[PDB]
Design a protein around this ligand. Sequence first.
Ligand code: CA
Length: 95
Amino acid sequence: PWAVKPEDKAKYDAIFDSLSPVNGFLSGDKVKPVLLNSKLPVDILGRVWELSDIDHDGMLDRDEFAVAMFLVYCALEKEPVPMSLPPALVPPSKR
Ligand SMILES: [Ca+2]
């Protein structure tokens, strides 16, 4: 299934709407700070975001911002983040 779970997409959809979503999008100006509070370096926010910004336009939609929350929260516990968007974390819209 999708690397993100329904319980994770629920906290991701709250964190996504905790930055002020725009018609279903968030500007790096909101997620950026939301990627730093993770205590991670800008390298993770540079890779995680990349694998999170399905569109890669400096913004994260509710589904793209979701991929950036579990990709970050995993770097705080112990799971680092690669730079290759895996097909298990990507939605059927990237197919
Ligand atoms: Ca986007």
